[PDB]
Scaffold this motif. Structure first.
Motif, PDB file in Angstrom:
ATOM      1  N   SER A   1       0.830  -1.229  -0.031  1.00  0.00           N
ATOM      2  CA  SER A   1       0.084   0.088   0.108  1.00  0.00           C
ATOM      3  C   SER A   1       0.855   1.240   0.058  1.00  0.00           C
ATOM      4  O   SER A   1       1.962   1.191   0.595  1.00  0.00           O
ATOM      5  CB  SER A   1      -0.975   0.024   1.136  1.00  0.00           C
ATOM      6  OG  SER A   1      -0.214  -0.192   2.504  1.00  0.00           O
ATOM      7  N   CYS A   2       0.451   2.265  -0.507  1.00  0.00           N
ATOM      8  CA  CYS A   2       1.265   3.619  -0.775  1.00  0.00           C
ATOM      9  C   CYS A   2       1.212   4.117   0.470  1.00  0.00           C
ATOM     10  O   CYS A   2       0.031   4.379   1.337  1.00  0.00           O
ATOM     11  CB  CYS A   2       0.434   4.639  -1.825  1.00  0.00           C
ATOM     12  SG  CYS A   2       1.118   6.321  -1.902  1.00  0.00           S
ATOM     13  N   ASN A   3       2.390   4.873   0.858  1.00  0.00           N
ATOM     14  CA  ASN A   3       2.682   5.506   2.000  1.00  0.00           C
ATOM     15  C   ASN A   3       1.861   6.933   2.078  1.00  0.00           C
ATOM     16  O   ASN A   3       1.794   7.575   3.219  1.00  0.00           O
ATOM     17  CB  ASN A   3       3.986   5.961   1.872  1.00  0.00           C
ATOM     18  CG  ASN A   3       4.477   5.727   3.499  1.00  0.00           C
ATOM     19  OD1 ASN A   3       4.091   5.044   4.338  1.00  0.00           O
ATOM     20  ND2 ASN A   3       5.796   6.492   3.868  1.00  0.00           N
ATOM     21  N   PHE A   4       1.354   7.479   1.005  1.00  0.00           N
ATOM     22  CA  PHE A   4       0.606   8.789   1.063  1.00  0.00           C
ATOM     23  C   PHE A   4      -0.869   8.779   0.898  1.00  0.00           C
ATOM     24  O   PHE A   4      -1.498   9.591   1.330  1.00  0.00           O
ATOM     25  CB  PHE A   4       1.495   9.838   0.018  1.00  0.00           C
ATOM     26  CG  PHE A   4       2.924   9.761   0.157  1.00  0.00           C
ATOM     27  CD1 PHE A   4       3.660  10.542   1.264  1.00  0.00           C
ATOM     28  CD2 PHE A   4       3.711   9.077  -0.955  1.00  0.00           C
ATOM     29  CE1 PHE A   4       4.813  10.598   1.021  1.00  0.00           C
ATOM     30  CE2 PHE A   4       4.990   9.208  -0.778  1.00  0.00           C
ATOM     31  CZ  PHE A   4       5.683   9.974   0.152  1.00  0.00           C
ATOM     32  N   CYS A   5      -1.361   7.867   0.044  1.00  0.00           N
ATOM     33  CA  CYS A   5      -2.667   7.560   0.084  1.00  0.00           C
ATOM     34  C   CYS A   5      -3.197   6.563   1.084  1.00  0.00           C
ATOM     35  O   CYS A   5      -4.126   6.992   1.952  1.00  0.00           O
ATOM     36  CB  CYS A   5      -3.234   6.783  -1.399  1.00  0.00           C
ATOM     37  SG  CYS A   5      -2.261   7.608  -2.733  1.00  0.00           S
ATOM     38  N   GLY A   6      -2.628   5.436   1.035  1.00  0.00           N
ATOM     39  CA  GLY A   6      -3.107   4.268   1.962  1.00  0.00           C
ATOM     40  C   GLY A   6      -3.950   3.377   1.085  1.00  0.00           C
ATOM     41  O   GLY A   6      -4.295   2.052   1.721  1.00  0.00           O
TER      42      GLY A   6
ATOM     43  N   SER B   1       5.714   5.705 -10.248  1.00  0.00           N
ATOM     44  CA  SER B   1       5.053   6.544  -9.262  1.00  0.00           C
ATOM     45  C   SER B   1       3.584   5.502  -8.862  1.00  0.00           C
ATOM     46  O   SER B   1       3.423   4.768  -9.487  1.00  0.00           O
ATOM     47  CB  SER B   1       4.502   8.023 -10.040  1.00  0.00           C
ATOM     48  OG  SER B   1       4.124   7.678 -11.404  1.00  0.00           O
ATOM     49  N   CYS B   2       3.107   6.161  -7.814  1.00  0.00           N
ATOM     50  CA  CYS B   2       2.025   5.468  -7.323  1.00  0.00           C
ATOM     51  C   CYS B   2       0.707   5.674  -8.519  1.00  0.00           C
ATOM     52  O   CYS B   2       0.669   6.744  -9.023  1.00  0.00           O
ATOM     53  CB  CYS B   2       1.565   5.955  -6.173  1.00  0.00           C
ATOM     54  SG  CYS B   2      -0.163   5.537  -5.479  1.00  0.00           S
ATOM     55  N   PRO B   3      -0.011   4.726  -8.762  1.00  0.00           N
ATOM     56  CA  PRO B   3      -1.187   4.958  -9.601  1.00  0.00           C
ATOM     57  C   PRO B   3      -2.169   6.094  -9.044  1.00  0.00           C
ATOM     58  O   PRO B   3      -3.041   6.499  -9.811  1.00  0.00           O
ATOM     59  CB  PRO B   3      -1.560   3.633  -9.821  1.00  0.00           C
ATOM     60  CG  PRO B   3      -0.633   2.823  -9.605  1.00  0.00           C
ATOM     61  CD  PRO B   3       0.163   3.361  -8.541  1.00  0.00           C
ATOM     62  N   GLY B   4      -2.199   6.430  -8.061  1.00  0.00           N
ATOM     63  CA  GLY B   4      -3.269   7.209  -7.372  1.00  0.00           C
ATOM     64  C   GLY B   4      -2.809   8.481  -7.262  1.00  0.00           C
ATOM     65  O   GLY B   4      -3.656   9.378  -7.634  1.00  0.00           O
ATOM     66  N   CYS B   5      -1.805   8.705  -6.604  1.00  0.00           N
ATOM     67  CA  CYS B   5      -1.326  10.270  -6.186  1.00  0.00           C
ATOM     68  C   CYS B   5      -0.108  10.721  -7.053  1.00  0.00           C
ATOM     69  O   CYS B   5       0.134  11.974  -7.002  1.00  0.00           O
ATOM     70  CB  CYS B   5      -0.998  10.413  -4.850  1.00  0.00           C
ATOM     71  SG  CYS B   5       0.144   9.091  -4.061  1.00  0.00           S
TER      72      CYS B   5
HETATM   73 ZN   LIG Z   1      -0.231   7.021  -3.597  1.00  0.00          ZN
END
Ligand SMILES: [Zn+2]
Ligand SMILES: [Zn+2]
Ligand SMILES: [Zn+2]
Ligand SMILES: [Zn+2]
Ligand SMILES: [Zn+2]
Lengths: 112, 74, 303
Positions: B55-60, B70-74
Protein backbone atom coordinates in the motif's frame (compact mmCIF):
# COMPACT_ATOMS: atom_id res chain seq x y z
CA UNK A 1 33.47 9.74 -5.75
CA UNK A 2 34.17 6.10 -4.94
CA UNK A 3 30.46 5.27 -4.68
CA UNK A 4 29.72 6.87 -8.05
CA UNK A 5 32.62 5.09 -9.74
CA UNK A 6 31.45 1.77 -8.29
CA UNK A 7 27.87 2.37 -9.41
CA UNK A 8 29.02 3.04 -12.98
CA UNK A 9 30.46 -0.48 -13.21
CA UNK A 10 27.31 -1.99 -11.64
CA UNK A 11 28.82 -3.44 -8.45
CA UNK A 12 26.11 -2.93 -5.84
CA UNK A 13 27.52 -5.37 -3.29
CA UNK A 14 30.74 -3.39 -2.84
CA UNK A 15 28.89 -0.06 -2.90
CA UNK A 16 26.51 -1.17 -0.16
CA UNK A 17 29.39 -2.69 1.82
CA UNK A 18 31.12 0.70 1.74
CA UNK A 19 27.91 2.50 2.71
CA UNK A 20 27.40 0.16 5.66
CA UNK A 21 30.88 0.66 7.16
CA UNK A 22 31.28 4.33 6.23
CA UNK A 23 32.93 6.55 8.83
CA UNK A 24 30.73 9.59 8.08
CA UNK A 25 27.09 9.82 9.13
CA UNK A 26 25.93 11.45 5.89
CA UNK A 27 27.17 8.50 3.83
CA UNK A 28 25.87 5.99 6.40
CA UNK A 29 22.38 7.49 6.08
CA UNK A 30 22.09 6.76 2.34
CA UNK A 31 20.25 3.41 2.28
CA UNK A 32 17.94 4.41 5.15
CA UNK A 33 15.71 7.04 3.51
CA UNK A 34 12.50 5.55 2.07
CA UNK A 35 13.34 1.82 2.06
CA UNK A 36 10.46 0.61 4.26
CA UNK A 37 7.44 -1.17 2.78
CA UNK A 38 3.88 -1.15 4.11
CA UNK A 39 1.86 -4.35 3.69
CA UNK A 40 -1.85 -4.98 4.31
CA UNK A 41 -4.08 -8.03 4.73
CA UNK A 42 -6.24 -8.49 1.64
CA UNK A 43 -9.14 -10.13 3.47
CA UNK A 44 -9.91 -7.26 5.86
CA UNK A 45 -8.01 -4.45 4.09
CA UNK A 46 -6.22 -3.35 7.25
CA UNK A 47 -2.57 -2.49 7.88
CA UNK A 48 -0.42 -5.17 9.47
CA UNK A 49 1.81 -4.68 12.51
CA UNK A 50 5.55 -4.28 12.09
CA UNK A 51 6.51 -7.72 13.44
CA UNK A 52 4.18 -10.70 13.10
CA UNK A 53 2.46 -13.01 10.61
CA UNK A 54 -1.12 -13.17 11.96
CA UNK A 55 -3.81 -10.59 11.23
CA UNK A 56 -5.19 -8.58 14.14
CA UNK A 57 -8.87 -8.92 13.18
CA UNK A 58 -9.25 -11.85 10.77
CA UNK A 59 -7.05 -14.04 13.02
CA UNK A 60 -5.72 -15.66 9.84
CA UNK A 61 -2.13 -15.90 8.70
CA UNK A 62 -1.56 -13.86 5.55
CA UNK A 63 2.07 -14.68 4.67
CA UNK A 64 1.09 -18.05 3.24
CA UNK A 65 3.39 -19.53 0.61
CA UNK A 66 1.49 -20.15 -2.61
CA UNK A 67 3.63 -23.21 -3.44
CA UNK A 68 4.72 -24.97 -0.25
CA UNK A 69 1.77 -23.86 1.93
CA UNK A 70 3.88 -22.93 4.96
CA UNK A 71 4.29 -19.67 6.85
CA UNK A 72 6.74 -17.12 5.45
CA UNK A 73 8.67 -15.33 8.20
CA UNK A 74 11.55 -14.09 6.04
CA UNK A 75 11.83 -13.09 2.40
CA UNK A 76 8.63 -12.70 0.39
CA UNK A 77 8.35 -12.25 -3.38
CA UNK A 78 5.32 -10.53 -4.87
CA UNK A 79 3.59 -10.01 -8.21
CA UNK A 80 2.03 -6.61 -8.83
CA UNK A 81 -0.55 -7.87 -11.30
CA UNK A 82 -2.52 -10.51 -9.40
CA UNK A 83 -1.17 -9.85 -5.87
CA UNK A 84 0.18 -13.36 -5.21
CA UNK A 85 3.57 -14.63 -4.12
CA UNK A 86 5.58 -16.70 -1.71
CA UNK A 87 9.09 -17.75 -0.71
CA UNK A 88 11.90 -16.13 -2.68
CA UNK A 89 13.38 -19.41 -3.94
CA UNK A 90 10.07 -21.25 -4.41
CA UNK A 91 8.45 -18.89 -6.91
CA UNK A 92 11.79 -18.57 -8.71
CA UNK A 93 11.93 -22.31 -9.39
CA UNK A 94 8.23 -22.52 -10.24
CA UNK A 95 8.44 -19.70 -12.78
CA UNK A 96 11.22 -21.32 -14.83
CA UNK A 97 9.09 -24.37 -15.58
CA UNK A 98 5.65 -22.82 -16.08
CA UNK A 99 4.10 -19.49 -17.02
CA UNK A 100 1.10 -19.49 -14.68
CA UNK A 101 0.45 -18.03 -11.26
CA UNK A 102 0.84 -20.99 -8.87
CA UNK A 103 -2.17 -19.87 -6.83
CA UNK A 104 -4.22 -20.56 -9.95
CA UNK A 105 -5.92 -17.30 -10.89
CA UNK A 106 -5.37 -17.50 -14.65
CA UNK A 107 -2.59 -14.90 -14.74
CA UNK A 108 0.55 -14.96 -16.88
CA UNK A 109 2.74 -13.22 -14.35
CA UNK A 110 5.65 -12.39 -16.65
CA UNK A 111 3.31 -11.72 -19.60
CA UNK A 112 5.26 -14.44 -21.39
CA UNK B 1 -18.53 -30.11 -16.86
CA UNK B 2 -21.03 -30.47 -14.06
CA UNK B 3 -23.61 -27.69 -13.63
CA UNK B 4 -22.99 -24.88 -11.17
CA UNK B 5 -25.80 -26.21 -8.97
CA UNK B 6 -24.04 -29.46 -8.02
CA UNK B 7 -20.56 -27.97 -7.64
CA UNK B 8 -22.07 -25.83 -4.86
CA UNK B 9 -23.14 -28.88 -2.84
CA UNK B 10 -21.11 -28.94 0.36
CA UNK B 11 -19.97 -32.50 -0.26
CA UNK B 12 -17.93 -32.16 -3.46
CA UNK B 13 -15.91 -29.32 -1.93
CA UNK B 14 -15.11 -31.50 1.08
CA UNK B 15 -13.73 -34.20 -1.22
CA UNK B 16 -11.64 -31.73 -3.22
CA UNK B 17 -10.17 -30.17 -0.08
CA UNK B 18 -9.38 -33.60 1.37
CA UNK B 19 -7.56 -34.59 -1.81
CA UNK B 20 -5.56 -31.36 -1.73
CA UNK B 21 -4.59 -31.96 1.90
CA UNK B 22 -3.50 -35.50 1.02
CA UNK B 23 -1.32 -34.10 -1.76
CA UNK B 24 0.16 -31.61 0.71
CA UNK B 25 1.03 -34.33 3.24
CA UNK B 26 3.13 -36.34 0.77
CA UNK B 27 5.04 -33.13 -0.10
CA UNK B 28 3.74 -33.16 -3.69
CA UNK B 29 3.68 -29.40 -4.13
CA UNK B 30 3.92 -28.88 -7.90
CA UNK B 31 1.20 -31.46 -8.54
CA UNK B 32 -1.10 -29.53 -6.21
CA UNK B 33 -0.54 -26.31 -8.17
CA UNK B 34 -1.13 -28.19 -11.42
CA UNK B 35 -4.44 -29.43 -10.01
CA UNK B 36 -5.34 -25.93 -8.81
CA UNK B 37 -4.88 -24.45 -12.28
CA UNK B 38 -7.11 -27.09 -13.94
CA UNK B 39 -9.72 -26.69 -11.19
CA UNK B 40 -9.87 -22.90 -11.42
CA UNK B 41 -10.21 -23.10 -15.20
CA UNK B 42 -13.33 -25.28 -14.95
CA UNK B 43 -15.04 -24.34 -11.67
CA UNK B 44 -15.12 -20.54 -11.23
CA UNK B 45 -17.12 -20.58 -8.00
CA UNK B 46 -14.11 -20.89 -5.69
CA UNK B 47 -11.76 -17.97 -5.13
CA UNK B 48 -7.97 -18.42 -4.95
CA UNK B 49 -5.78 -17.84 -1.93
CA UNK B 50 -5.87 -14.53 -0.06
CA UNK B 51 -2.54 -12.95 0.86
CA UNK B 52 -0.87 -9.59 1.57
CA UNK B 53 -0.62 -6.54 -0.69
CA UNK B 54 1.55 -3.40 -0.73
CA UNK B 55 0.00 0.00 0.00
CA UNK B 56 1.12 3.55 -0.78
CA UNK B 57 2.62 5.66 2.01
CA UNK B 58 0.73 8.84 1.09
CA UNK B 59 -2.72 7.54 0.08
CA UNK B 60 -3.16 4.30 1.97
CA UNK B 61 -4.56 2.67 -1.17
CA UNK B 62 -3.15 -0.36 -2.99
CA UNK B 63 -0.57 -0.04 -5.75
CA UNK B 64 -1.86 -3.21 -7.39
CA UNK B 65 -4.01 -3.25 -10.53
CA UNK B 66 1.72 7.66 -15.93
CA UNK B 67 5.22 6.73 -14.81
CA UNK B 68 5.80 3.06 -14.07
CA UNK B 69 7.63 4.33 -10.97
CA UNK B 70 4.94 6.53 -9.42
CA UNK B 71 1.86 5.52 -7.44
CA UNK B 72 -1.16 5.04 -9.73
CA UNK B 73 -3.24 7.14 -7.35
CA UNK B 74 -1.36 10.26 -6.21
CA UNK C 1 1.88 -57.97 2.62
CA UNK C 2 4.12 -56.26 5.18
CA UNK C 3 7.81 -56.93 5.86
CA UNK C 4 9.66 -55.86 9.00
CA UNK C 5 13.16 -54.39 9.45
CA UNK C 6 15.29 -53.09 12.32
CA UNK C 7 16.17 -49.41 12.63
CA UNK C 8 19.60 -48.17 13.74
CA UNK C 9 18.79 -46.08 16.82
CA UNK C 10 20.69 -46.34 20.11
CA UNK C 11 18.63 -46.19 23.31
CA UNK C 12 19.87 -46.91 26.82
CA UNK C 13 16.48 -47.33 28.54
CA UNK C 14 13.00 -48.68 27.73
CA UNK C 15 10.74 -46.66 25.42
CA UNK C 16 7.29 -45.61 26.64
CA UNK C 17 5.76 -43.75 23.67
CA UNK C 18 6.61 -43.03 20.03
CA UNK C 19 5.16 -40.24 17.90
CA UNK C 20 5.47 -38.72 14.43
CA UNK C 21 4.96 -35.32 12.79
CA UNK C 22 2.68 -34.19 9.98
CA UNK C 23 5.04 -34.97 7.10
CA UNK C 24 6.82 -37.92 8.70
CA UNK C 25 10.39 -36.61 9.00
CA UNK C 26 10.79 -36.06 12.77
CA UNK C 27 9.98 -38.33 15.68
CA UNK C 28 9.97 -38.05 19.47
CA UNK C 29 10.54 -40.88 21.96
CA UNK C 30 10.40 -40.90 25.75
CA UNK C 31 12.34 -43.39 27.87
CA UNK C 32 12.52 -44.73 31.42
CA UNK C 33 15.11 -42.22 32.69
CA UNK C 34 12.80 -39.26 31.93
CA UNK C 35 14.49 -38.23 28.69
CA UNK C 36 12.99 -37.15 25.37
CA UNK C 37 14.85 -37.42 22.06
CA UNK C 38 14.09 -35.85 18.68
CA UNK C 39 15.19 -37.84 15.64
CA UNK C 40 15.58 -36.38 12.15
CA UNK C 41 15.61 -38.22 8.83
CA UNK C 42 17.88 -37.55 5.85
CA UNK C 43 17.97 -37.90 2.08
CA UNK C 44 19.96 -41.14 2.41
CA UNK C 45 17.33 -42.61 4.72
CA UNK C 46 19.20 -42.86 8.01
CA UNK C 47 18.03 -41.33 11.29
CA UNK C 48 20.15 -38.98 13.38
CA UNK C 49 19.69 -37.34 16.77
CA UNK C 50 19.18 -33.62 17.39
CA UNK C 51 18.23 -33.14 21.04
CA UNK C 52 18.11 -34.81 24.45
CA UNK C 53 16.98 -33.37 27.77
CA UNK C 54 15.52 -34.44 31.11
CA UNK C 55 12.07 -33.02 31.64
CA UNK C 56 9.93 -33.86 34.65
CA UNK C 57 10.20 -34.90 38.31
CA UNK C 58 8.47 -38.27 38.05
CA UNK C 59 7.85 -40.71 35.20
CA UNK C 60 6.93 -39.54 31.69
CA UNK C 61 4.07 -41.35 29.93
CA UNK C 62 3.38 -39.50 26.68
CA UNK C 63 4.67 -37.10 24.04
CA UNK C 64 2.78 -35.64 21.06
CA UNK C 65 3.33 -33.27 18.15
CA UNK C 66 1.45 -30.28 16.71
CA UNK C 67 0.58 -28.97 13.28
CA UNK C 68 3.45 -27.18 11.50
CA UNK C 69 1.36 -24.06 10.88
CA UNK C 70 1.93 -23.25 14.54
CA UNK C 71 5.70 -23.80 14.58
CA UNK C 72 7.50 -26.71 16.26
CA UNK C 73 5.57 -27.56 19.42
CA UNK C 74 5.64 -30.64 21.66
CA UNK C 75 3.56 -31.64 24.67
CA UNK C 76 4.39 -34.11 27.43
CA UNK C 77 2.44 -35.43 30.41
CA UNK C 78 3.95 -37.09 33.46
CA UNK C 79 3.26 -38.57 36.90
CA UNK C 80 3.95 -35.37 38.87
CA UNK C 81 0.59 -33.73 38.14
CA UNK C 82 1.85 -31.51 35.29
CA UNK C 83 1.93 -31.22 31.51
CA UNK C 84 4.50 -29.11 29.66
CA UNK C 85 4.88 -27.44 26.26
CA UNK C 86 8.21 -27.31 24.41
CA UNK C 87 9.26 -25.14 21.46
CA UNK C 88 12.35 -25.25 19.23
CA UNK C 89 14.63 -22.21 18.92
CA UNK C 90 17.53 -22.33 16.47
CA UNK C 91 18.85 -25.97 18.20
CA UNK C 92 17.82 -26.09 21.85
CA UNK C 93 14.24 -26.68 22.93
CA UNK C 94 12.96 -24.43 25.72
CA UNK C 95 10.02 -24.49 28.11
CA UNK C 96 6.99 -22.28 27.65
CA UNK C 97 4.27 -23.19 30.14
CA UNK C 98 3.47 -25.69 32.88
CA UNK C 99 -0.13 -26.72 33.56
CA UNK C 100 -0.49 -27.36 37.30
CA UNK C 101 -4.27 -27.32 37.78
CA UNK C 102 -4.36 -31.09 38.35
CA UNK C 103 -4.36 -32.86 41.70
CA UNK C 104 -3.47 -36.41 40.56
CA UNK C 105 -1.36 -38.02 37.82
CA UNK C 106 -2.05 -36.97 34.23
CA UNK C 107 -2.55 -39.96 31.95
CA UNK C 108 -3.00 -38.51 28.44
CA UNK C 109 -2.53 -35.28 26.49
CA UNK C 110 -3.76 -34.52 22.96
CA UNK C 111 -3.70 -31.56 20.58
CA UNK C 112 -6.89 -30.46 18.85
CA UNK C 113 -7.59 -30.39 15.11
CA UNK C 114 -6.42 -27.31 13.28
CA UNK C 115 -9.63 -25.50 12.44
CA UNK C 116 -10.42 -24.73 16.10
CA UNK C 117 -7.13 -22.91 16.66
CA UNK C 118 -4.37 -24.03 19.04
CA UNK C 119 -6.11 -26.11 21.72
CA UNK C 120 -5.03 -28.88 24.06
CA UNK C 121 -6.98 -31.29 26.27
CA UNK C 122 -5.59 -33.28 29.20
CA UNK C 123 -7.14 -35.90 31.46
CA UNK C 124 -6.28 -37.13 34.96
CA UNK C 125 -6.93 -40.09 37.24
CA UNK C 126 -9.46 -38.26 39.44
CA UNK C 127 -12.15 -38.11 36.75
CA UNK C 128 -11.55 -34.62 35.36
CA UNK C 129 -10.99 -33.73 31.71
CA UNK C 130 -9.72 -30.20 31.04
CA UNK C 131 -9.33 -28.08 27.91
CA UNK C 132 -6.91 -25.19 27.29
CA UNK C 133 -6.52 -22.57 24.56
CA UNK C 134 -4.01 -19.92 23.49
CA UNK C 135 -5.69 -16.78 22.10
CA UNK C 136 -2.40 -15.48 20.63
CA UNK C 137 -0.43 -17.83 18.38
CA UNK C 138 2.76 -15.78 18.75
CA UNK C 139 2.75 -15.97 22.57
CA UNK C 140 2.88 -19.59 23.73
CA UNK C 141 3.59 -18.61 27.35
CA UNK C 142 -0.02 -17.45 27.89
CA UNK C 143 -2.67 -20.18 28.08
CA UNK C 144 -6.21 -20.17 29.46
CA UNK C 145 -8.63 -22.69 30.94
CA UNK C 146 -12.05 -22.87 29.30
CA UNK C 147 -13.89 -26.10 30.16
CA UNK C 148 -14.03 -28.79 32.83
CA UNK C 149 -15.78 -32.15 32.52
CA UNK C 150 -16.58 -34.53 35.39
CA UNK C 151 -16.74 -38.21 34.44
CA UNK C 152 -17.34 -39.89 37.84
CA UNK C 153 -14.73 -42.55 37.02
CA UNK C 154 -10.99 -42.94 36.44
CA UNK C 155 -9.95 -41.60 33.03
CA UNK C 156 -7.25 -43.46 31.09
CA UNK C 157 -7.40 -42.26 27.45
CA UNK C 158 -8.90 -39.54 25.26
CA UNK C 159 -9.33 -38.93 21.54
CA UNK C 160 -10.61 -36.08 19.37
CA UNK C 161 -12.85 -36.24 16.29
CA UNK C 162 -10.75 -35.36 13.22
CA UNK C 163 -13.68 -34.35 11.01
CA UNK C 164 -13.49 -30.73 9.85
CA UNK C 165 -16.75 -30.40 7.92
CA UNK C 166 -19.19 -27.59 8.62
CA UNK C 167 -21.91 -30.02 9.75
CA UNK C 168 -20.00 -31.72 12.59
CA UNK C 169 -19.70 -30.13 15.99
CA UNK C 170 -16.56 -30.78 18.04
CA UNK C 171 -16.47 -34.16 19.77
CA UNK C 172 -14.34 -35.96 22.34
CA UNK C 173 -14.35 -39.46 23.83
CA UNK C 174 -13.07 -40.68 27.20
CA UNK C 175 -12.25 -44.19 28.40
CA UNK C 176 -11.84 -45.73 31.84
CA UNK C 177 -9.61 -48.44 33.29
CA UNK C 178 -11.39 -49.01 36.62
CA UNK C 179 -11.69 -52.65 37.63
CA UNK C 180 -14.63 -52.04 40.02
CA UNK C 181 -16.74 -55.23 40.16
CA UNK C 182 -19.88 -53.72 38.66
CA UNK C 183 -21.61 -53.18 35.30
CA UNK C 184 -21.02 -49.52 34.50
CA UNK C 185 -20.22 -48.37 30.98
CA UNK C 186 -16.59 -47.42 30.48
CA UNK C 187 -16.71 -45.27 27.32
CA UNK C 188 -18.73 -42.06 26.93
CA UNK C 189 -18.70 -39.34 24.27
CA UNK C 190 -19.08 -35.60 24.86
CA UNK C 191 -20.32 -33.13 22.26
CA UNK C 192 -20.21 -29.34 22.02
CA UNK C 193 -23.41 -27.27 22.04
CA UNK C 194 -23.11 -24.06 20.04
CA UNK C 195 -26.04 -22.40 21.84
CA UNK C 196 -25.20 -22.77 25.53
CA UNK C 197 -21.45 -22.93 24.80
CA UNK C 198 -20.91 -25.99 27.03
CA UNK C 199 -20.02 -29.67 26.62
CA UNK C 200 -22.74 -32.26 27.15
CA UNK C 201 -22.92 -36.04 27.27
CA UNK C 202 -24.37 -37.40 24.03
CA UNK C 203 -23.90 -41.18 23.99
CA UNK C 204 -22.62 -43.96 26.23
CA UNK C 205 -21.47 -47.34 24.93
CA UNK C 206 -23.36 -49.57 27.36
CA UNK C 207 -22.00 -52.80 25.86
CA UNK C 208 -18.38 -52.10 26.87
CA UNK C 209 -18.44 -53.10 30.56
CA UNK C 210 -14.79 -54.16 30.99
CA UNK C 211 -11.41 -52.39 31.44
CA UNK C 212 -10.34 -50.17 28.53
CA UNK C 213 -6.73 -49.24 27.80
CA UNK C 214 -7.05 -47.17 24.60
CA UNK C 215 -9.57 -45.63 22.22
CA UNK C 216 -9.03 -43.99 18.83
CA UNK C 217 -11.04 -42.28 16.10
CA UNK C 218 -10.37 -42.57 12.38
CA UNK C 219 -9.99 -39.82 9.74
CA UNK C 220 -13.17 -38.81 7.93
CA UNK C 221 -12.15 -38.39 4.27
CA UNK C 222 -15.74 -37.40 3.49
CA UNK C 223 -17.70 -40.39 4.78
CA UNK C 224 -21.25 -40.30 6.14
CA UNK C 225 -20.33 -41.72 9.57
CA UNK C 226 -17.61 -42.01 12.21
CA UNK C 227 -15.41 -45.02 13.00
CA UNK C 228 -14.26 -45.76 16.55
CA UNK C 229 -11.81 -48.37 17.86
CA UNK C 230 -11.54 -49.75 21.40
CA UNK C 231 -8.75 -51.62 23.22
CA UNK C 232 -10.11 -54.00 25.88
CA UNK C 233 -9.46 -57.73 26.36
CA UNK C 234 -10.61 -57.91 22.72
CA UNK C 235 -10.46 -55.52 19.75
CA UNK C 236 -13.78 -53.99 18.65
CA UNK C 237 -14.83 -51.47 16.00
CA UNK C 238 -17.99 -49.37 16.31
CA UNK C 239 -19.72 -46.98 13.92
CA UNK C 240 -21.82 -43.90 14.68
CA UNK C 241 -24.39 -42.41 12.32
CA UNK C 242 -26.00 -38.98 12.63
CA UNK C 243 -29.80 -38.98 12.62
CA UNK C 244 -30.15 -30.53 22.27
CA UNK C 245 -27.32 -32.89 21.36
CA UNK C 246 -27.71 -34.94 18.21
CA UNK C 247 -28.67 -38.62 18.23
CA UNK C 248 -26.66 -41.53 16.86
CA UNK C 249 -27.36 -45.08 15.69
CA UNK C 250 -24.44 -47.00 17.19
CA UNK C 251 -23.66 -50.31 15.46
CA UNK C 252 -20.82 -52.82 15.71
CA UNK C 253 -18.88 -54.33 12.83
CA UNK C 254 -15.90 -56.14 14.32
CA UNK C 255 -14.97 -58.16 17.40
CA UNK C 256 -11.61 -59.95 17.29
CA UNK C 257 -10.00 -62.23 19.85
CA UNK C 258 -6.81 -63.33 18.02
CA UNK C 259 -4.51 -61.96 20.75
CA UNK C 260 -5.50 -64.13 23.76
CA UNK C 261 -4.18 -61.27 25.89
CA UNK C 262 -4.97 -57.65 26.75
CA UNK C 263 -4.44 -55.30 23.81
CA UNK C 264 -2.77 -52.03 24.78
CA UNK C 265 -2.67 -49.65 21.78
CA UNK C 266 -4.68 -48.97 18.61
CA UNK C 267 -3.73 -46.54 15.84
CA UNK C 268 -5.10 -45.72 12.37
CA UNK C 269 -3.45 -44.55 9.16
CA UNK C 270 -3.84 -41.38 7.11
CA UNK C 271 -6.71 -42.73 5.00
CA UNK C 272 -8.55 -44.65 7.73
CA UNK C 273 -8.64 -48.14 6.24
CA UNK C 274 -5.91 -50.08 8.08
CA UNK C 275 -5.63 -50.61 11.83
CA UNK C 276 -2.70 -51.53 14.07
CA UNK C 277 -2.90 -53.36 17.38
CA UNK C 278 -0.45 -54.35 20.12
CA UNK C 279 -1.18 -57.10 22.64
CA UNK C 280 0.54 -58.83 25.54
CA UNK C 281 1.95 -61.58 23.34
CA UNK C 282 4.64 -59.50 21.65
CA UNK C 283 3.07 -59.34 18.19
CA UNK C 284 1.66 -56.52 16.06
CA UNK C 285 -1.35 -57.28 13.85
CA UNK C 286 -2.95 -55.31 11.01
CA UNK C 287 -6.60 -55.37 9.97
CA UNK C 288 -8.40 -54.23 6.83
CA UNK C 289 -11.82 -54.20 5.22
CA UNK C 290 -12.74 -56.41 2.27
CA UNK C 291 -15.01 -56.39 -0.78
CA UNK C 292 -17.86 -57.77 1.36
CA UNK C 293 -17.22 -55.02 3.96
CA UNK C 294 -16.02 -57.69 6.39
CA UNK C 295 -12.92 -57.00 8.46
CA UNK C 296 -10.21 -59.61 7.96
CA UNK C 297 -6.66 -59.89 9.25
CA UNK C 298 -3.93 -58.88 6.81
CA UNK C 299 -0.53 -59.38 8.46
CA UNK C 300 1.19 -60.65 11.59
CA UNK C 301 4.55 -59.27 12.75
CA UNK C 302 6.52 -60.52 15.74
CA UNK C 303 8.60 -58.01 17.67
ZN1 LIG D 1 -0.26 6.93 -3.58
ZN1 LIG E 1 -7.13 -9.30 7.96
ZN1 LIG F 1 7.24 -21.98 0.38
ZN1 LIG G 1 -2.16 -14.80 -9.12
ZN1 LIG H 1 0.61 -12.33 -11.31
Amino acid sequence: SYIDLLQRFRLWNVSNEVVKLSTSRAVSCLNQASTTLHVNCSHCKRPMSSRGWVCDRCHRCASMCAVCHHVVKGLFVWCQGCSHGGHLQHIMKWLEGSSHCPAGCGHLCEYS
Amino acid sequence: GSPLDVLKDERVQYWIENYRNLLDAWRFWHKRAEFDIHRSKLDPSSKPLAQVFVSCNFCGKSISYSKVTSCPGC
Amino acid sequence: MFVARSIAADHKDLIHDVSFDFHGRRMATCSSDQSVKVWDKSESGDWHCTASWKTHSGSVWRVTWAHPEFGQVLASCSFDRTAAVWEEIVSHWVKRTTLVDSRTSVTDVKFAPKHMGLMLATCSADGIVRIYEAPDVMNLSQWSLQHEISCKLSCSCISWNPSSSRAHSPMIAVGSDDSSPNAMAKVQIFEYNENTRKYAKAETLMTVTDPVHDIAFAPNLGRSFHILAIATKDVRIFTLKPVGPTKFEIHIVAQFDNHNSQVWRVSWNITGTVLASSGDDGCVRLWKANYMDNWKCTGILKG
